Structure 1
């Protein structure tokens, strides 16, 4: 079984920023892409962005740019997801997701072959 962990549940004030984690192993971290989604509370989920673990290329949802940013380090080998402008209505379970294999001759970043999922990072905010 592949090893996969996020940062635990988090708490903020509305309008603040978040730094949710994902630190998997079992495969070399530059093998498969990393994806993030927002599981709404009683509504359909929404898609945030994807990581190329091997390069600085990034892409995010067409509605979430500016609100979301997301980076990675290789000294410790972990990637961090960020989101500004939190509200009480968007409090949700934020999931780390594994993408498709990384090929240098064709693009598979957007393939939704999500074989592995994190345990879920709940975030809730209050005044």
Structure 2
């Protein structure tokens, strides 16, 4: 059972640096090359570099030279990649991966043989500042209120960074819940909506509450969504 354990999601301002760690387990850390790669929107898979954990010798992609540094602490079996002068181009998911076995007899540093992958580290580069959402009710129609079914929801507005999660009635209500992926607005803030379809015969008696969790700002709001 090999597992590559990476550090958690990071949010950075343009111009800042980020350092991601990777602690591989399930094999001997100094026996295999470590590579760093990323998946960035509209750029595909990009190779940052390789590091030999035995010697600390590294090589960087030519488009990363001068702004990425790879190091390791063998005493804790941990690899690090630091990327400097971040811009929106650097918003991506970064992966530590295992590469070829390290031999004294031949150079396999550049074998693109990535058997095992870390869980990925999201870095988001933005000038936006952390902010909890405003939560507004999306009331069911005056018209759908008549037996049958009605759609109602919560508008989770102007928050940063991702993610927010939404449940309904503390997770007691799951059937017919659709939470939409957030939109990233021109302000750099996100908004999303979550809607649930309920029998319209139920509106007014049965209480509907959307539970919005925005952990990055340490806020939760439980918002009642009522007719009218």
Q: Which has the higher helix share?
A: 2
Contact 1:2-1:25 within 8 A present in 2 as well: yes
Structure 1 match to 2:65? 65
- Rounded Cα–Cα distance in structure 1 between residues aligned with 2:227 and 2:80: 23
How many residues are aligned here? 126
Residue by residue, what CA displacement relative to the aligned partner does 1:71-114 show, whole Å, maximum 9, x if unpaired? 11122221110011111232000111110001011010111111
- Rounded Cα–Cα distance in structure 2 between residues aligned with 1:79 and 1:18: 14
- Rounded Cα–Cα distance in structure 2 between residues aligned with 1:16 and 1:84: 6
The yes-or-no answer on 1:10 pairing with 2:13 is: no
Question: Counterpart of 2:89 in 1: which secondary structure?
Answer: helix
- Rounded Cα–Cα distance in structure 1 between residues aligned with 2:41 and 2:68: 20
Residue by residue, what CA displacement relative to the aligned partner does 1:40-76 show, whole Å, maximum 9, x if unpaired? 1143221101110100211000121111111111222
Contact 2:3-2:118 within 8 A present in 1 as well: no
- Rounded Cα–Cα distance in structure 1 between residues aligned with 2:56 and 2:89: 32
Q: Which has the higher strand share?
A: 2
- Rounded Cα–Cα distance in structure 1 between residues aligned with 2:226 and 2:60: 23
Question: Using a 3 Å threshold, how does the CA distance of structure 1 residues 31 and 84 change in structure 2: closer, same or farther?
Answer: same
> TM-score scaled by structure 2?
0.52
Runs of 4+ in 1 over 4 A off after TM superposition: 124-127
Q: CA RMSD in A?
A: 6.3
Contact 1:14-1:125 within 8 A present in 2 as well: no
Structure ranking higher on relative contact order (CA contacts 8 Å, 6+ apart): 1
Question: Counterpart of 1:75 in 2: which secondary structure?
Answer: helix
Structure 1 residue 4: Cα displacement:
1.7
Question: Using a 3 Å threshold, how does the CA distance of structure 1 residues 47 and 125 change in structure 2: closer, same or farther?
Answer: farther
Q: Which has the larger radius of gyration?
A: 2
Could you tell me which runs of 5 or more consecutive residues in structure 1 were left unpaired when the two chains were aligned: none
Contact 1:39-1:46 within 8 A present in 2 as well: yes
Structure 1 residue 20: Cα displacement:
0.3
Question: Counterpart of 1:19 in 2: which secondary structure?
Answer: strand
Contact 2:3-2:24 within 8 A present in 1 as well: yes
Deviates more, 1:36-45 or 1:20-29: 36-45
Could you tell me which runs of 5 or more consecutive residues in structure 2 were left unpaired when the two chains were aligned: 123-224
